[PDB]
């Protein structure tokens, strides 16, 4: 099922899940099916496993399937994983921020307008209510990336 999800062959994985196979299959690195599915940007395979409730679990490298999807600029599987009926704000905003980050520096998927728009969407959804607000836990500045200190306000963004 893992190599079916990594490849684009949705028929093989849908037949495998039609046989009542294990969706919570742990791997050596912790990647459980959806991590391979939402790495090649296969939206239909991810839908097939969410239909069978493959569940979201953090792998060995500290990455959810949603964060794995957002790491590789694959926006559609990010959309599908953001509607899991248990996603929470903190994960949703960190996924949107990760997607905007990934769109900034990549060979295949390089859009700077998508970078700004997804960062602004995550910032607006951060500072949307004014109550139980989710302020950014900004890391200390790093000399490699100039001397910037992220963007803790929508005005500086």
């Amino acid at each position: 099922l893992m190599i079916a999800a990594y490849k684009g062959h949705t028929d093989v994985v849908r037949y495998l899940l039609e046989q009542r196979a294990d969706p919570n299959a742990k791997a050596h690195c912790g990647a459980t099916a959806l991590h391979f599915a939402a790495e090649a940007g296969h939206i239909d395979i991810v839908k097939e496993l969410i239909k069978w409730r493959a569940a979201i679990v953090v792998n060995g490298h500290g990455m959810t399937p949603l964060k794995v999807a957002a790491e590789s600029c694959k926006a559609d599987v990010v959309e599908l994983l953001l509607s899991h009926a248990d996603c929470d704000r903190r994960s949703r905003i960190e996924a949107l921020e990760l997607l905007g980050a990934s769109f900034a520096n990549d060979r295949e998927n390089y859009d700077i307008i998508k970078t700004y728009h997804y960062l602004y969407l995550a910032m607006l959804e951060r500072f949307q209510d004014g109550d139980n607000i989710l302020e950014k836990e900004v890391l200390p500045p790093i000399h490699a990336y100039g001397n910037r200190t992220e963007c803790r306000n929508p005005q500086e963004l």
Partner: peptide, 15 residues
Amino acid sequence: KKHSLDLLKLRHLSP
């Protein structure tokens, strides 16, 4: 010669 174009789990992606 275009450093950007020069850029570019192997045992796990085996069948």
